[PDB]
Design a protein around this ligand. Sequence first.
Ligand code: HEM
Ligand code: HEM
Ligand code: HEM
Ligand code: HEM
Lengths: 141, 141, 146, 146
Amino acid sequence: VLSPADKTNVKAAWGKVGAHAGEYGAEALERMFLSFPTTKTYFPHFDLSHGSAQVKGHGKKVADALTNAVAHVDDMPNALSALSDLHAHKLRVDPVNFKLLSHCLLVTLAAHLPAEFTPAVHASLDKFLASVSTVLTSKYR
Amino acid sequence: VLSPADKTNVKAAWGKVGAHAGEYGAEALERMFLSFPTTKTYFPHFDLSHGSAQVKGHGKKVADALTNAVAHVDDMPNALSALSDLHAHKLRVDPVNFKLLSHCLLVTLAAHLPAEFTPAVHASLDKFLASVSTVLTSKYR
Amino acid sequence: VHLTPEEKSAVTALWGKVNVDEVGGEALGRLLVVYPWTQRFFESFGDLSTPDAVMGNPKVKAHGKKVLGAFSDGLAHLDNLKGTFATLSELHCDKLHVDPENFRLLGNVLVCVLAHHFGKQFTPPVQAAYQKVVAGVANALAHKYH
Amino acid sequence: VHLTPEEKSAVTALWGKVNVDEVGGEALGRLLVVYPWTQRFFESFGDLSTPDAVMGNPKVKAHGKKVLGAFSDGLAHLDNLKGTFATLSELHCDKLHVDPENFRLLGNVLVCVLAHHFGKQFTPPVQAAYQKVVAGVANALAHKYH
Ligand code: HEM
Ligand code: HEM
Ligand code: HEM
Ligand code: HEM
């Protein structure tokens, strides 16, 4: 449950990302694939080698989805509806993996936004990624 | 979210629990403590022996709360308000333990409802116990 | 995997009464009904869009007897689960791309099915010994993943 | 708990730049802020209601030190995390009643803190290596739970 505090935290930290969203998106995914190999099972059609364009491509789509979630923070279910259909009915990633990625997002942003990655913003972003996860996994059954 | 089928499934099954509700909750907790001994870390002040009065009292309390939720399936956050507040701010059980108790409840229901623990009803109770749990964990942060 | 032989014996006594054919189909099918995302691995099985469709689906009963058969062999091998399941783990990782989380889901679904099937006989200490077993199996089936 | 030779070298080399005082208080306070239910164990510590309260709290800083100090010593014995941590494990279970889940959340926060402290030096590979350590530590702390 994003408090106003949180949205402000998220908007600000996400503001500072800006043009590197998709670069961060890409690094989060590869931090994921190396830390939690299990997540690869959902990408058997990807070349998963370092510096791959498939991953940077996917990295960017993930980042754009998040940037879209940040902008429609107050109405994520609707802003994200197409994405939650697709995860529910097509991709069917086990819910556990959303926490793996979110953790890797967080690690990515810490590594990149040292000064903005405050304990408070940390908490907010964590809640923010759980809420996106919950929306993505919303229609699973 | 719970559909009308779900609600019906749960009320039907819970109706069969009827007056066995507290016996069932004590049994679910015993199951939980033995299968998931880490959950005992939350009951250090309890006597955790088969039959203990404390587990029996707590079982009934848990079963009553759940009976209340079934009755309020449409109004859970409000129905379970004291309980989410209590778990958020006082008990503070890590959210992972909800899914362990949920499992043991479901196992207990399955052991006791040979006739009604159909697959659809199973799916329904599982979703129901996930909703309860999301409620009780609502205000954690 | 830490099973006392009070636990060992109880797993053993119960498993002998298990209709591996029937329990297999039940478990796999409930798996697919309760946690529908797991359908993703079974497009090739035909209709799985309803409970009744999944539960009577011949390829599900048939895959379940196969899954449970292999689970059943593991029981003779609680001392060496990793070993018994090395090849299946590789198969699930490299060929099938099964996220090992699924093995956990199935293990719990299985414990529910044994509850349903054995009623009061599926006592809390017997359940506990089955949770150790089912976790042991999910880890062995996960252990060749990379 | 297996690290390749170069992971062990990556882990050991980063850790030699780590100031256990600072990183320990940072990781613990963040734990308390990001997952406030972990506060349940530190009611003796004082007012934990806000991030500044938590990150300034001097008991939190002290404890963070203690925790990361024992974590540091176990890096020395990656090959025997169970033996090394067995006594803390039985303490955390039988005395402190700490849900081992907390050891996992702590490891993830620690990883974030390392990333935040080190920036680009915390490369995907070095994280993966730390994710392994942090998981091994958690499982070693969790092992004598009964
Ligand atoms: C913050 C969490 C996530 C977000 C915002 C997200 C967002 C997206 C977006 C925008 C797409 C593009 C769909 C399209 O238009 O083709 C996608 C696809 C996909 N996602 Fe998710 N996703 C998330 C989590 C995950 C996780 C944790 C996994 C599992 C490791 C996963 C597995 C997949 C797969 C396999 C695809 C299809 C990729 C392809 O074949 O092109 N996702 N996601
Ligand atoms: C469906 C899930 C749950 C329900 C409906 C539930 C319900 C309840 C109820 C009715 C009470 C008593 C409130 C009172 O004192 O008046 C309670 C207390 C408590 N619950 Fe929860 N609970 C759930 C989950 C859990 C889990 C998963 C754990 C830990 C593994 C836990 C730990 C506790 C503890 C420690 C107490 C206080 C016991 C005492 O000191 O007497 N609960 N719960
Ligand atoms: C209790 C753990 C499990 C065991 C012991 C097990 C065992 C097996 C066996 C014996 C086979 C056939 C191997 C062969 O081709 O020779 C198989 C294949 C397969 N398994 Fe698993 N299995 C388990 C769990 C799962 C789960 C939970 C899923 C996913 C929901 C899954 C998905 C599949 C798929 C998609 C195949 C190939 C099906 C086909 O195309 O015929 N398995 N498994
Ligand atoms: C890497 C994981 C951890 C390690 C290595 C660790 C280590 C330690 C050590 C060395 C002590 C004091 C030893 C003693 O006084 O005999 C301690 C005490 C304690 N730990 Fe852990 N700890 C860990 C994680 C956690 C977590 C995540 C929590 C809770 C969120 C926790 C809660 C406590 C508490 C409440 C005490 C007693 C402290 C006191 O009374 O001042 N620990 N821990």
